[PDB]
Structure formats: structure tokens, C-alpha cells
């Protein structure tokens, strides 16, 4: 992984030693080059994972998550450089440094062999993310959003640290390859119930699980666009990636410990989908849409079937591009009208025709139109939960109806109807904004031609 | 907020339209349109207002009972089949300011004339505001009515968005 | 019920402006200033059939003949119906006729 870690680190001197007016050009060009080389991780084998060294490994789960992570950095830079234009030079370079450092922590997090190394980088991501929200958010509520984000995470993560250290004492290793062979079954006792909770709750909060999700709508409504993109696209998936790995050592106790969380997720996805129908803030609507989508991922991980694990992987990747695209779409309106209220600016299709097309394509992926990888992921989870229990189809089917209604309600409210008369500063879509939207949707749809690369190890 | 006369005349027009929806055929509608006009005529000179209000009150109850559940609606009227149909083609005039110079170059004469309208709007704004200030009571305007231009060479205050509004069939 | 004198005057003034504005939407003769029998009906149909039927059917047939049908079970046909009294091209076998019917 040194061929990715080191060039990522080099982006920092690159940004700091650039000419004043070339910080965005240089950082964007070379982060795109790093993303190109990330495709070399597709050397996956049917039986063995790609095991580089004693520290780092990559398998079919972490590979698509790595490529998404390295793809997002250039997109984030493009998305940020307009609202940061008036910032002074040193504070721009600091902002870019936080983005680079987040990428560095993330690629190491998704490839760490040892669970305690994973924990430390898993936790290091809080610092740049918190700094980005509270320093470069626009509103007073960003300070409170930072605190909710910080302490929800640490409330669950500190128990995880104790559980992991306890496991290493008992088993002798936290190396994931070792744990695949030395894993022992988990017996019923109150000790193991709390071991199970300590091992899972930190990941549930990050997904987020319904009931522990209140931090998320705060964090998005307050974060700057780049903070929203990485928060939605990648940082939520730390929780999903965490469970997909740690559930290896929690069987067979997951048979019954999953029940409370499957119920919260199955009911939660309907509650949070219904909430989207009455949201007045466009960014808050997109944030609540993430909670509903990640509820499926939690259910998929908890029922532990080959089909559910494949659907969970595809869903995490697909939601990453869709949700980040939706935040970018909402931000482009915000840069003109400087408000997140959905009903403020309407009929925008009349004024911005091509942008309305990006809105349509993002909506259709959000509601999982076949054969998008959004639909592939959701369908695989639906297929596997039906085998878990036939009645889940009622809840899963109802959530599909609600998802269409709010996905198209958002499209109809902002794009259709009559334009607002007094909003006369809707300038034409910039080339930068159009390129930003295409760099989301084009790879998303191209993946429909070869879905296997985003289906994970169980493929 | 509607006077008694306004209420009675609105009921007459509404009742004739629902009557025409029932009759369909023109000769049949003419027959019953005259019978209906006779009923309104039978009480035209009622002077005791209490009695007249009772007549109007009862007539509205009779109208509600006998209204057509699917009356004819003019296609472009609210609730009609063409209502708001062309709104997606109505583009505000300010959008033209954002045209690329090569787009404006295609209509040199249109954009020269447009520049004169913007000059007229600019030169007239301060007088428009001043007229509204000095013609509005101290508390504020009590109705939505606007005045005309008084002096020659002045424009009626708040004219731009009425004059330059989109055409009803903009394409 | 009727326009007040002040309402009449304002409508008259707005009416003059609106009609001048609409008249100003007419395009001048030079606008837009743009930068720089039977047989001809056979041609368009001939070139269209060549680029939209012949070329695509050349591509599909090549694709089907040399890639798809070179793999097992990619194109599966229902076997032909065989009736009594038929002759098989592959073998030359002759299917016997049905029995003699009763009269009906």
C-alpha cells in the first residue's frame, strides 16, 4: 500500500510548494493520477486476498472502497474551490491538507490487517472531519454539529477499544488473517452479550443505526460541501466495513443479538423515508435519505448470507456516488440562492436545463431504477431478507414506494412548476459544476456494465 | 368583502354556467336560461335587505343541491385541461442578460432595443419610488391599488414586471 | 361597477407600454445573424437502409456467427415439429403415415 500512501502524503508538499494560483490545479491533477493507479488493486484472486505485508492487505471488500475514496478527493477539491475563493492562501492550503490527511487515514483504514491498527485510523478520521465541519461550515450550528458528531462516535468507539484489547489478550492476535483461522464460537453469557455490543455499537453509530442517527442530519446541514461528500460517501461506510469484518468473530451469538437492530433498521428505514416527505431543508432531506439506505446495509450485514453480503457491498458503493452527487446538486443551487430551503427556488428546469438532467439521473439512481448498481444492491438485500423471513417483503416493498415518492418529490419541487419570480440571479451552470456531476453519474452507470467488481468477496 | 350586489351577480353567472352544463344543447339552454333570469327578475326590486339576504342565502343552498358534479370549465381557466400548460415555456426577461456574447450577436437589433428599455427603466425608477412615497398615507397603503403617472414624461409606478411580462404563448 | 378615472388612466398608460414592448419582440429581417423528386427519395431510403439495416445486420450476424453461436446453449431453438409422412433431411428417414381414419 506504500505505492498509495506515499504519493498521498506527497500531495501535501505539492499543495504547499505550489504557486499561489495553482493550488487547485496541481492538487486536483495529481489526486486524479493517484486515483488512476488505484485500479491496480483489482488484482484479486478467487481464493486468497491480496496480502501485501504484515500491516496492509486488500480484498474484494476494501478494493472498491479504496477506489471510491481516492476518486472522491479530486471531486471534493473541485466542489470546494468556489466557496473558498475569498479565503486567504494559507487557510486554503490548510483546508486541502485536511482533505489529503482524511484520504491518507481512509486508505490505511480500509487496508489495515490488524484490528487495533484499524481502530486507530478509524478514529483518526474524526479529527480532520471535525475540523472541516467546525472551521469551514457557514452557520452557528456547526459548533454543535461538531460536538454531536464527536461524542456520538467516541461513546461507542471507546467500548470497542476495550473489547478489541480484550480479544487480543484472549486470542493472542487481532490480525484479520489470523482471526479467520483461530476464531472460536461465542457462547451465551452476559459477558459475551456486552462483548457483542462493544464490538458492534461503534459501527452502528457510524452507519448510522436508527435511534443513534441524530448526529447525522446535524453534521450534513452544517458541513461544507466537501465535508458532506466524504461524510456521506465514505465515512458512513467505515461502520459497514467495520461490521463486515468484526462479525467474523461474533458467531453464533449474532443469531439473536441481531434482532433488536434488525427491527430498528427495518422500521427505521420506513420512518426515515417518511420523514423525507416532510423535510423543508434540501440538505436535511438528502441526509435523512442516507439513514434509510444504510438501514438496508445494517440488515444485510446482520443476517449474514452470501447474497446479503454482496448486496451490502454494492449498496455501499452505489450510495456513495448517488448521495455525494445529490449533495453536490443541492450545493450548486445553494451557491446561487444561498439558502437550503427546498421550496425557495422552483421551476429550475426552465432556467438550468442541463442541470435538471443531472437532477433526474441522480433521482433515478436514488430510487434504484434497474439495472443501476443502486437497484442491484437493494434487490440482493431484498432477496436475502425474504429468505430470512417472508414478511420482510412487506416492509421492504413499502419502503420502495416511499423512496420513489420523496426522490421525485424533491425533483418536482425544485425543478418543475413555475420559477420563483424574485430570484433573478440564477446564472448558467458553470463548466466546473457540470463536470462535477458527470464525474459522479458516469462511473456510477458504467459500473452497471461490470457489477462484479463492486460485489465484494462473497462474489 | 363582496357586497350584496356582487354576491347576487356572481351567483347568477355561476348558476347559468352549471345550467348550461346540464342542458348541453343550445336551444334547450336558451329556454332554461330565460326561466332562470325570470326567477332573479321576480325579486329584483326587493327593498327589505333582511328579506333579500334570506333569498340569496336560500338560492345558494338551491345552487349547491343542483350544481353539476362536473361542470364545463374553459380549457385555460383554473382547473381546465390547458391551465398552466405553457408555464414551462415562460422564461423571465432577465435571463437574457446572462447570454453569451456570441448568442447576443445573433440578434443585434433586438438587443439594441432591449438596451433602450433598460435605460428607460433605470431613468424612471427614482421618480416612481418618490411618487409612491408622497401619495401613500402615513400608516401605509391600505389597498393594493397603484396610481397612474401624473406628470407628462413619467411612467406609472411599478410598471416593469407588468409591461415586460412573458407572452401568453411564448413559443 | 366600473373603472375609476385613476384606474382608467393607469391601464391606458400600461397598455401603451405593453404594446410597445410586444412590438419590440419582432425580429428584424436580418435576424438571426448566423455565422458562416422521386429519385432523391430512393437515395435517402437507400443510404438509410445501408447504414441502419445492412451495416447493423453485418455486425450482428458476424457477432452471432463467430462469437455467440460458438458457445454452448447461447442460441437454443425449439426442435422442428415432425408430422407423419415427413422426410428427415439429416438421415433420409421417412416418418410413417397415421393409421387409416374412420369415416366422419
Amino acid at each position: 500500500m506504500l505505492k498509495y500512501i506515499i504519493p498521498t502524503i506527497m500531495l501535501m508538499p505539492l499543495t504547499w510548494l505550489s504557486k499561489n494560483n495553482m493550488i487547485w490545479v496541481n492538487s486536483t491533477a495529481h489526486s486524479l493520477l493517484i486515483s488512476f493507479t488505484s485500479l491496480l488493486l483489482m488484482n484479486q484472486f478467487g481464493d486468497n486476498s491480496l496480502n501485501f505485508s504484515l500491516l496492509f492487505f486488500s480484498d474484494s471488500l476494501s478494493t472498491p472502497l479504496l477506489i471510491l475514496t481516492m476518486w472522491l478527493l479530486p471531486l471534493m477539491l473541485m466542489a470546494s474551490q468556489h466557496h473558498l475563493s475569498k479565503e486567504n492562501l494559507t487557510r486554503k492550503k490548510l483546508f486541502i491538507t485536511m482533505l489529503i490527511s482524511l484520504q491518507l487515514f481512509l486508505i490505511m483504514t480500509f487496508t489495515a490487517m490488524e484490528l487495533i491498527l484499524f481502530y486507530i485510523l478509524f478514529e483518526a478520521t474524526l479529527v480532520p472531519t471535525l475540523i472541516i465541519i467546525t472551521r469551514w461550515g457557514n452557520q452557528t450550528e456547526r459548533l454543535n454539529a461538531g460536538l454531536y458528531f464527536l461524542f456520538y462516535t467516541l461513546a461507542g468507539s471507546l467500548p470497542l477499544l476495550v473489547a478489541l484489547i480484550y480479544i487480543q489478550n484472549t486470542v493472542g492476535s487481532l490480525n484479520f488473517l489470523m482471526l479467520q483461522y483461530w476464531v472460536q464460537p461465542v457462547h451465551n453469557s452476559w459477558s459475551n452479550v456486552f462483548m457483542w455490543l462493544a464490538c458492534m455499537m461503534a459501527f452502528m453509530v457510524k452507519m448510522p443505526l436508527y435511534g443513534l442517527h441524530l448526529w447525522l442530519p446535524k453534521a450534513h446541514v452544517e458541513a461544507p460541501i466537501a465535508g458532506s461528500m466524504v461524510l456521506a460517501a465514505v465515512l458512513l461506510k467505515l461502520g459497514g466495513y467495520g461490521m463486515l469484518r468484526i462479525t467474523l468473530i461474533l458467531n453464533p451469538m449474532t443469531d439473536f443479538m441481531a434482532y433488536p437492530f434488525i427491527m430498528l433498521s427495518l422500521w427505521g428505514m420506513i420512518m426515515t423515508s417518511s420523514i423525507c416527505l416532510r423535510q423543508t431543508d434540501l440538505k436535511s432531506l438528502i441526509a435523512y435519505s442516507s439513514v434509510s439506505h444504510m438501514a438496508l446495509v445494517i440488515v444485510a450485514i446482520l443476517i449474514q448470507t452470501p447474497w446479503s453480503y454482496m448486496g451490502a457491498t454494492a449498496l455501499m458503493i452505489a450510495h456513495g456516488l448517488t448521495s455525494s452527487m445529490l449533495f453536490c446538486l443541492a450545493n450548486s443551487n445553494y451557491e446561487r440562492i444561498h439558502s437550503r430551503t427546498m421550496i425557495l427556488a422552483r421551476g429550475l428546469q426552465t432556467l438550468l436545463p442541463l442541470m435538471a438532467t443531472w437532477w433526474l439521473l441522480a433521482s433515478l439512481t436514488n430510487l434504484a431504477l434497474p439495472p443501476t448498481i443502486n437497484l442491484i444492491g437493494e434487490l440482493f438485500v431484498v432477496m436475502s431478507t425474504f429468505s430470512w423471513s417472508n414478511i420482510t417483503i412487506i416492509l421492504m416493498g413499502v419502503n420502495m414506494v416511499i423512496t420513489a415518492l420523496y426522490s421525485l418529490y424533491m425533483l418536482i419541487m425544485t425543478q418543475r412548476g413555475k420559477y420563483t419570480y424574485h430570484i433573478n440571479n440564477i446564472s448558467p451552470s458553470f463548466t466546473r459544476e457540470n463536470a462535477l456531476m458527470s464525474l459522479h453519474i458516469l462511473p456510477l452507470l458504467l459500473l452497471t456494465l461490470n457489477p462484479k467488481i463492486i460485489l465484494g468477496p462473497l462474489y | 368583502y363582496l357586497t350584496h350586489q356582487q354576491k347576487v351577480l356572481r351567483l347568477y353567472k355561476r348558476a347559468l354556467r352549471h345550467l348550461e352544463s346540464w342542458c348541453i344543447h343550445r336551444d334547450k339552454y336558451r329556454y332554461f336560461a330565460c326561466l332562470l333570469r325570470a326567477r332573479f327578475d321576480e325579486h329584483k326590486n326587493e327593498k327589505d335587505m333582511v328579506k333579500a339576504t334570506q333569498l340569496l342565502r336560500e338560492a345558494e343552498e338551491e345552487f349547491w343541491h343542483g350544481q353539476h358534479p362536473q361542470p364545463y370549465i374553459f380549457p385555460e381557466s383554473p382547473g381546465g385541461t390547458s391551465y398552466e400548460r405553457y408555464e414551462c415555456y415562460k422564461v423571465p426577461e432577465w435571463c437574457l442578460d446572462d447570454w453569451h456574447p456570441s448568442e447576443k450577436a445573433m440578434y443585434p437589433d433586438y438587443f439594441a432595443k432591449r438596451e433602450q428599455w433598460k435605460k428607460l427603466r433605470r431613468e424612471s425608477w427614482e421618480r416612481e419610488v418618490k411618487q409612491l412615497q408622497e401619495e401613500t398615507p402615513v400608516g401605509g397603503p391600505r389597498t393594493e391599488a397603484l396610481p397612474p403617472a401624473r406628470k407628462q414624461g413619467d411612467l406609472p409606478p411599478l410598471w416593469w414586471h407588468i409591461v415586460t411580462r412573458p407572452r401568453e404563448r411564448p413559443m | 361597477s366600473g373603472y375609476t378615472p385613476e384606474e382608467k388612466l393607469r391601464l391606458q398608460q400600461l397598455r401603451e407600454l405593453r404594446r410597445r414592448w410586444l412590438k419590440d419582440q419582432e425580429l428584424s429581417p436580418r435576424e438571426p445573424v448566423l455565422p458562416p423528386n422521386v429519385i432523391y427519395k430512393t437515395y435517402r431510403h437507400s443510404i438509410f437502409a445501408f447504414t441502419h439495416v445492412l451495416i447493423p445486420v453485418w455486425i450482428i450476424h458476424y457477432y452471432l456467427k463467430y462469437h455467440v453461436t460458438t458457445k454452448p446453449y447461447t442460441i437454443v431453438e425449439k426442435k422442428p415439429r415432425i408430422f407423419p409422412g415427413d422426410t428427415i433431411l439429416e438421415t433420409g428417414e421417412v416418418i410413417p403415415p397415421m393409421k387409416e381414419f374412420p369415416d366422419q
Binding site: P353, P428 | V91, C95, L96, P166, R167, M171 | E26, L27
Partner: peptide, 12 residues
Amino acid sequence: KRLFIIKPSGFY
């Protein structure tokens, strides 16, 4: 006659 059609800019 022919009337100018007010559209948003299509150049970009």
C-alpha cells in the same frame, strides 16, 4: 411575423 423567443443561455 417572427418573434424573439426568450430562452436561458444555451451556450454554456
